[PDB]
Amino acid sequence: SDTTPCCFAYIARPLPRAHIKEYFYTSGKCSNPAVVFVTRKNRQVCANPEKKWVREYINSLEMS
Amino acid sequence: SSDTTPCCFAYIARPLPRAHIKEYFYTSGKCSNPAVVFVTRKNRQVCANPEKKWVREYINSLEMS
Amino acid sequence: SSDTTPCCFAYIARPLPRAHIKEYFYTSGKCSNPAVVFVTRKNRQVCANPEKKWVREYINSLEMS
Amino acid sequence: SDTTPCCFAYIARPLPRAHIKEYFYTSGKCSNPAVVFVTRKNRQVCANPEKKWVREYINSLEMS
Amino acid sequence: SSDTTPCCFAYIARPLPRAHIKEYFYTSGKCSNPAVVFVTRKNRQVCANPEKKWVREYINSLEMS
Amino acid sequence: SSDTTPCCFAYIARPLPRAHIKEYFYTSGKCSNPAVVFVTRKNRQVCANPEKKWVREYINSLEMS
Ligand SMILES: [Cl-]
Ligand SMILES: [Cl-]
């Protein structure tokens, strides 16, 4: 019965890659699929998982 | 600072100990399910059924303080 | 000292308890969706649909003393 | 629901960097993308994310 | 000398209820947009388009009732 | 509640007495002119020139307390 974070819209402009510390996917219970990027200062930004830059960011976060 | 929205997909079964609650809110209308969230003193966010008697009474207790 | 504008992108379904509401406001015409915001005694703010009968009745009750 | 803070205009003049405590990106639900700077005394100022000074302020906050 | 003056940058599309309005004024001609402001019994202020028929009817009623 | 936006069309000529100031804000970017508003203890809203040295120093005083 914990809340889970869901996204209902996406930032259009990519945020700076160097500011991003980690990412996660929102729960599949959520009505929309989403990636959440977490900044060094713990801003959380919803992103569209079908966008090329979101995929490049995730790939970079995971393999470097 | 965060543009995620907390949503609920289950309601807690046992009423929370009243003394552990410090605030409540209603989840956004964007969420698929309507819900009450009770925020505990340890800052757990607990989903609860808005129709339940004990939930309405807790909220009433917090608002009419 | 904020020049952000509070907007609503969804509404709560069930009327919240009348006795908890301290004031309302209409959101700005800048917002893409028209809305009412109810403010509770403890400053929860709840987005509500201006076309719903219960919303219009709550507003009326707050405006007529 | 809860309200979403949106920006419908931006401050032209950069505000003093030393007064700024934090920033956030407005929600993707908003019609106009924006940055909000929050001062030590909780003034909130709408700013244009494409402006260099805005990007540099954000970078300074994230990389500090 | 240098008081602020209220300006409107958008208008409420839905006419607000006529019975809630206690007075109106025009924003300053210095403002970039022309506007009527309706003031409710509870001192809510609502920007309105002075070219709209319902705004004129409201003003006429407020002046000649 | 307040659909209107406070805008400035003139800047006060004489620096306000610092002790009379309670807060400041920057006016909305919607306004045609950029401005600082000092809020006095009596709750007067005074428009002031953002480029003026004394204005920037008052603001700095208020933020850096
Ligand atoms: Cl997108
Ligand atoms: Cl209109």
Coordinates of C-alpha atoms and ligand atoms in Angstrom, one line a residue:
Chain A
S1 CA 0.0 0.0 0.0
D2 CA 2.9 2.4 -0.6
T3 CA 2.5 5.1 -3.1
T4 CA 4.4 4.6 -6.4
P5 CA 5.5 7.4 -8.6
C6 CA 3.8 7.8 -12.0
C7 CA 4.4 10.2 -14.9
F8 CA 1.7 11.9 -16.7
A9 CA 3.8 14.1 -19.1
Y10 CA 7.4 14.4 -20.3
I11 CA 9.9 17.1 -20.4
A12 CA 10.5 17.9 -24.1
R13 CA 14.1 19.2 -24.0
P14 CA 16.7 16.7 -22.8
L15 CA 18.2 17.8 -19.5
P16 CA 22.0 17.9 -19.3
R17 CA 23.6 14.5 -19.3
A18 CA 26.3 15.4 -16.7
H19 CA 23.6 16.4 -14.1
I20 CA 22.1 12.9 -14.1
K21 CA 23.0 10.5 -11.2
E22 CA 20.6 7.6 -11.9
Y23 CA 17.3 6.5 -13.5
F24 CA 14.5 4.2 -13.0
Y25 CA 11.3 3.0 -14.7
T26 CA 8.0 3.8 -13.2
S27 CA 5.9 0.9 -12.2
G28 CA 4.0 -1.0 -14.9
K29 CA 0.9 -0.3 -12.8
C30 CA 1.1 3.3 -13.9
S31 CA -1.1 4.3 -16.9
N32 CA 1.9 5.7 -18.9
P33 CA 5.3 4.1 -19.3
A34 CA 8.1 6.4 -18.2
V35 CA 11.7 6.8 -17.3
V36 CA 12.6 9.0 -14.4
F37 CA 16.0 10.7 -14.3
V38 CA 17.5 11.7 -11.0
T39 CA 19.9 14.5 -10.8
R40 CA 22.9 15.0 -8.5
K41 CA 20.7 17.3 -6.4
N42 CA 17.8 14.8 -6.5
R43 CA 15.6 16.6 -9.0
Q44 CA 13.4 13.9 -10.6
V45 CA 12.4 14.4 -14.3
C46 CA 9.9 12.2 -16.3
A47 CA 11.1 11.2 -19.7
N48 CA 9.5 9.4 -22.7
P49 CA 11.1 5.9 -23.0
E50 CA 10.6 5.9 -26.8
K51 CA 12.9 8.9 -27.4
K52 CA 16.3 8.4 -28.8
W53 CA 18.0 10.6 -26.3
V54 CA 16.4 8.8 -23.3
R55 CA 17.8 5.5 -24.6
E56 CA 21.3 7.1 -25.2
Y57 CA 21.2 8.4 -21.6
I58 CA 20.2 5.0 -20.1
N59 CA 22.8 3.2 -22.2
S60 CA 25.4 5.7 -21.0
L61 CA 24.3 5.5 -17.4
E62 CA 24.6 1.7 -17.5
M63 CA 27.8 1.1 -19.5
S64 CA 30.2 3.8 -18.2
Chain B
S1 CA 11.6 19.6 -7.6
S2 CA 10.0 16.3 -8.7
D3 CA 7.3 16.0 -11.4
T4 CA 6.3 12.4 -10.6
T5 CA 2.9 12.0 -9.0
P6 CA 2.3 9.5 -6.1
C7 CA -0.4 7.0 -7.0
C8 CA -2.1 4.2 -5.2
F9 CA -2.9 0.7 -6.4
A10 CA -3.8 -1.0 -3.1
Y11 CA -5.4 0.2 0.2
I12 CA -3.9 -0.8 3.6
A13 CA -6.0 -3.4 5.2
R14 CA -5.5 -2.6 8.9
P15 CA -6.3 0.9 10.1
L16 CA -3.1 2.8 10.8
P17 CA -2.4 3.7 14.5
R18 CA -3.8 7.2 14.7
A19 CA -0.8 8.5 16.7
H20 CA 1.5 7.6 13.8
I21 CA -0.2 9.9 11.3
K22 CA 1.0 13.5 10.9
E23 CA -0.8 14.5 7.6
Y24 CA -2.9 13.3 4.8
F25 CA -3.6 14.2 1.2
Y26 CA -5.9 13.1 -1.6
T27 CA -4.0 11.6 -4.6
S28 CA -4.1 13.5 -7.9
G29 CA -7.1 13.0 -10.2
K30 CA -4.6 11.9 -12.8
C31 CA -4.1 8.7 -10.9
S32 CA -6.1 5.8 -12.1
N33 CA -7.6 5.1 -8.6
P34 CA -8.9 7.6 -6.1
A35 CA -7.1 7.4 -2.7
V36 CA -6.1 9.0 0.5
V37 CA -2.5 9.0 1.5
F38 CA -1.6 9.2 5.2
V39 CA 1.9 10.5 5.9
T40 CA 3.3 8.8 9.0
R41 CA 5.7 10.3 11.5
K42 CA 8.5 8.3 10.0
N43 CA 7.4 9.7 6.6
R44 CA 5.9 6.6 5.1
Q45 CA 3.2 7.3 2.5
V46 CA 0.4 4.9 3.1
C47 CA -2.5 4.4 0.6
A48 CA -5.9 4.1 2.1
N49 CA -9.5 3.6 0.9
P50 CA -11.3 7.0 0.8
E51 CA -14.7 5.3 1.4
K52 CA -13.6 3.7 4.6
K53 CA -15.1 5.0 7.9
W54 CA -11.8 5.1 9.8
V55 CA -10.2 7.0 6.9
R56 CA -12.8 9.7 6.7
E57 CA -12.7 10.0 10.5
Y58 CA -8.9 10.4 10.6
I59 CA -9.1 13.1 7.9
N60 CA -11.8 14.8 9.7
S61 CA -9.7 14.6 12.9
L62 CA -6.8 16.3 11.0
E63 CA -8.8 19.0 9.3
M64 CA -10.9 20.0 12.3
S65 CA -8.0 20.2 14.8
Chain C
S1 CA 6.7 36.1 -3.9
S2 CA 6.0 33.5 -6.7
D3 CA 5.2 34.3 -10.3
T4 CA 4.3 30.7 -11.0
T5 CA 0.6 30.1 -11.8
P6 CA -1.1 27.1 -10.1
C7 CA -2.9 25.0 -12.8
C8 CA -5.0 21.9 -12.7
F9 CA -4.7 19.0 -15.1
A10 CA -7.3 16.7 -13.6
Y11 CA -10.1 16.8 -11.0
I12 CA -11.1 14.8 -7.9
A13 CA -14.2 12.7 -8.4
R14 CA -15.9 12.4 -5.0
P15 CA -16.9 15.7 -3.4
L16 CA -14.7 16.3 -0.4
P17 CA -16.3 17.2 2.9
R18 CA -17.9 20.6 2.8
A19 CA -17.0 21.4 6.4
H20 CA -13.3 21.0 5.6
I21 CA -13.3 23.7 2.9
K22 CA -12.1 27.2 4.0
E23 CA -12.0 28.9 0.6
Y24 CA -11.9 28.4 -3.2
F25 CA -10.4 30.1 -6.2
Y26 CA -10.8 29.8 -10.0
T27 CA -7.5 29.0 -11.7
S28 CA -6.0 31.6 -14.1
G29 CA -7.3 31.9 -17.6
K30 CA -3.7 31.1 -18.7
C31 CA -4.2 27.5 -17.6
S32 CA -5.1 25.1 -20.4
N33 CA -8.0 23.6 -18.4
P34 CA -10.4 25.6 -16.3
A35 CA -10.7 24.6 -12.7
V36 CA -11.7 25.4 -9.2
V37 CA -9.3 24.9 -6.3
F38 CA -10.8 24.2 -2.9
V39 CA -8.6 25.1 0.1
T40 CA -9.1 23.2 3.3
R41 CA -8.6 24.4 6.9
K42 CA -5.2 22.8 6.8
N43 CA -4.3 24.2 3.3
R44 CA -4.7 21.1 1.3
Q45 CA -5.6 22.3 -2.2
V46 CA -7.9 20.2 -4.4
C47 CA -8.6 20.6 -8.1
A48 CA -12.3 20.4 -9.0
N49 CA -14.3 20.5 -12.1
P50 CA -16.3 23.8 -12.5
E51 CA -19.1 22.2 -14.4
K52 CA -20.0 19.7 -11.7
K53 CA -23.1 20.5 -9.7
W54 CA -21.5 19.8 -6.3
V55 CA -18.6 22.1 -7.1
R56 CA -20.9 25.0 -8.1
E57 CA -23.0 24.5 -5.0
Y58 CA -19.9 24.5 -2.7
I59 CA -18.8 27.8 -4.4
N60 CA -22.2 29.2 -3.9
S61 CA -22.3 28.3 -0.3
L62 CA -18.9 29.9 0.3
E63 CA -19.8 33.1 -1.5
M64 CA -23.2 33.6 0.1
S65 CA -21.9 34.1 3.6
Chain D
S1 CA -6.0 16.9 -7.4
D2 CA -3.0 19.0 -6.4
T3 CA -2.1 22.1 -8.4
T4 CA 0.9 22.2 -10.8
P5 CA 3.0 25.4 -10.9
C6 CA 3.3 26.7 -14.4
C7 CA 5.2 29.6 -16.0
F8 CA 3.7 31.8 -18.7
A9 CA 6.5 34.3 -19.0
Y10 CA 10.2 34.7 -18.0
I11 CA 12.3 37.3 -16.1
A12 CA 14.7 38.9 -18.6
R13 CA 17.4 40.1 -16.2
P14 CA 19.5 37.3 -14.5
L15 CA 18.8 37.4 -10.8
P16 CA 21.7 37.4 -8.3
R17 CA 23.3 33.9 -8.3
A18 CA 24.0 34.2 -4.5
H19 CA 20.3 34.5 -3.7
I20 CA 19.4 31.2 -5.4
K21 CA 18.9 28.2 -3.2
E22 CA 17.5 25.7 -5.7
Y23 CA 15.8 25.2 -9.0
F24 CA 13.3 22.9 -10.6
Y25 CA 11.9 22.3 -14.1
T26 CA 8.2 22.8 -14.4
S27 CA 6.0 19.9 -15.3
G28 CA 5.7 18.7 -18.9
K29 CA 2.0 19.3 -18.4
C30 CA 2.6 23.0 -18.6
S31 CA 2.2 24.6 -22.0
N32 CA 5.5 26.5 -21.7
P33 CA 8.7 24.8 -20.6
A34 CA 10.4 26.7 -17.8
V35 CA 12.9 26.7 -15.0
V36 CA 11.9 28.0 -11.5
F37 CA 14.7 29.4 -9.3
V38 CA 13.9 29.5 -5.6
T39 CA 15.7 32.1 -3.5
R40 CA 16.8 31.8 0.1
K41 CA 13.6 33.6 1.2
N42 CA 11.5 31.4 -1.1
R43 CA 10.9 33.8 -3.9
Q44 CA 10.2 31.7 -7.0
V45 CA 11.2 33.2 -10.4
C46 CA 10.3 31.8 -13.8
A47 CA 13.2 31.6 -16.2
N48 CA 13.7 30.5 -19.8
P49 CA 15.6 27.2 -20.1
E50 CA 17.2 28.1 -23.4
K51 CA 19.0 31.2 -22.0
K52 CA 22.7 30.6 -21.3
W53 CA 22.7 32.3 -17.9
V54 CA 19.8 30.0 -16.8
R55 CA 21.6 26.9 -18.0
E56 CA 24.8 28.0 -16.3
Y57 CA 23.0 28.7 -13.0
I58 CA 21.4 25.2 -13.2
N59 CA 24.8 23.7 -13.9
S60 CA 26.3 25.5 -10.9
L61 CA 23.6 24.2 -8.6
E62 CA 23.8 20.6 -9.9
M63 CA 27.6 20.4 -9.9
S64 CA 28.4 22.2 -6.6
Chain E
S1 CA 3.5 57.6 -6.9
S2 CA 4.7 54.2 -8.0
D3 CA 2.0 51.8 -6.8
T4 CA 1.5 48.6 -8.6
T5 CA -1.6 48.4 -10.7
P6 CA -3.4 45.2 -11.5
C7 CA -3.3 43.9 -15.1
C8 CA -4.9 40.9 -16.8
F9 CA -3.1 38.6 -19.2
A10 CA -5.9 36.1 -19.8
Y11 CA -9.7 35.8 -19.2
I12 CA -11.9 33.2 -17.6
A13 CA -14.0 31.6 -20.4
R14 CA -16.9 30.5 -18.2
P15 CA -19.1 33.3 -16.9
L16 CA -19.0 33.3 -13.1
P17 CA -22.3 33.3 -11.3
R18 CA -23.9 36.8 -11.4
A19 CA -25.1 36.6 -7.8
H20 CA -21.6 36.2 -6.4
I21 CA -20.4 39.6 -7.8
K22 CA -20.4 42.6 -5.6
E23 CA -18.5 45.1 -7.9
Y24 CA -16.3 45.5 -10.9
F25 CA -13.6 47.8 -12.3
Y26 CA -11.5 48.3 -15.4
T27 CA -7.8 47.7 -15.4
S28 CA -5.6 50.7 -16.1
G29 CA -5.2 51.7 -19.7
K30 CA -1.5 51.4 -19.0
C31 CA -2.0 47.6 -19.0
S32 CA -1.2 45.9 -22.3
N33 CA -4.6 44.2 -22.5
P34 CA -8.0 45.8 -21.7
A35 CA -9.9 44.0 -19.0
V36 CA -12.8 44.1 -16.6
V37 CA -12.2 42.7 -13.1
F38 CA -15.2 41.2 -11.3
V39 CA -15.0 41.2 -7.5
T40 CA -17.0 38.6 -5.6
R41 CA -18.7 38.9 -2.2
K42 CA -15.6 37.0 -0.8
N43 CA -13.2 39.3 -2.6
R44 CA -12.2 36.9 -5.3
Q45 CA -11.0 38.9 -8.4
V46 CA -11.7 37.4 -11.8
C47 CA -10.4 38.9 -15.1
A48 CA -13.0 39.2 -17.9
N49 CA -13.0 40.1 -21.6
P50 CA -14.7 43.5 -22.0
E51 CA -15.8 42.6 -25.6
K52 CA -17.9 39.6 -24.4
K53 CA -21.7 40.0 -24.3
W54 CA -22.0 38.5 -20.8
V55 CA -19.5 40.9 -19.4
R56 CA -21.5 43.9 -20.7
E57 CA -24.8 42.4 -19.3
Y58 CA -23.1 42.0 -15.9
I59 CA -21.7 45.5 -15.9
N60 CA -25.1 46.9 -17.0
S61 CA -26.8 45.0 -14.2
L62 CA -24.3 46.1 -11.6
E63 CA -24.8 49.7 -12.6
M64 CA -28.6 49.9 -13.0
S65 CA -30.1 47.5 -10.5
Chain F
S1 CA -8.8 35.0 -5.6
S2 CA -6.2 37.0 -7.6
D3 CA -6.4 36.5 -11.3
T4 CA -4.7 39.9 -11.7
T5 CA -1.0 40.5 -11.9
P6 CA 0.6 43.6 -10.2
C7 CA 2.6 45.6 -12.8
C8 CA 4.7 48.7 -12.5
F9 CA 4.7 51.7 -14.8
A10 CA 6.9 54.1 -12.7
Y11 CA 9.8 53.7 -10.3
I12 CA 9.9 55.5 -6.9
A13 CA 12.3 58.5 -7.1
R14 CA 13.5 58.6 -3.5
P15 CA 14.9 55.4 -1.8
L16 CA 12.4 53.9 0.6
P17 CA 13.3 54.0 4.3
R18 CA 14.9 50.6 4.8
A19 CA 13.1 50.0 8.1
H20 CA 9.7 50.3 6.3
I21 CA 10.4 47.3 4.1
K22 CA 9.0 43.9 5.0
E23 CA 9.6 42.0 1.7
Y24 CA 10.2 42.3 -2.0
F25 CA 9.3 40.5 -5.2
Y26 CA 10.1 40.8 -8.9
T27 CA 7.1 41.5 -11.0
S28 CA 5.9 39.0 -13.5
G29 CA 7.6 38.7 -16.8
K30 CA 4.1 39.2 -18.3
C31 CA 4.4 42.9 -17.3
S32 CA 5.7 45.2 -20.0
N33 CA 8.3 46.7 -17.6
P34 CA 10.7 44.9 -15.4
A35 CA 10.4 46.0 -11.8
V36 CA 11.0 45.3 -8.1
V37 CA 8.2 45.7 -5.7
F38 CA 9.0 46.5 -2.1
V39 CA 6.2 45.6 0.4
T40 CA 6.1 48.0 3.3
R41 CA 5.1 47.3 6.9
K42 CA 1.8 49.1 6.2
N43 CA 1.5 46.7 3.2
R44 CA 2.0 49.3 0.5
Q45 CA 3.4 47.9 -2.8
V46 CA 6.1 50.3 -4.1
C47 CA 7.5 49.9 -7.6
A48 CA 11.3 50.4 -7.9
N49 CA 14.0 50.4 -10.6
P50 CA 15.7 47.0 -10.7
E51 CA 19.0 48.5 -11.9
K52 CA 19.3 51.0 -9.1
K53 CA 22.1 50.3 -6.6
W54 CA 20.0 50.9 -3.5
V55 CA 17.3 48.5 -4.8
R56 CA 19.8 45.7 -5.5
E57 CA 21.3 46.3 -2.0
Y58 CA 17.9 46.2 -0.2
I59 CA 17.0 42.9 -2.0
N60 CA 20.4 41.6 -1.1
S61 CA 19.8 42.6 2.5
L62 CA 16.5 40.8 2.5
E63 CA 17.7 37.6 0.9
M64 CA 21.0 37.3 2.9
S65 CA 19.5 37.8 6.4
Ligands
CL1 CL 8.6 13.9 -25.3
CL2 CL -13.1 35.0 -23.1

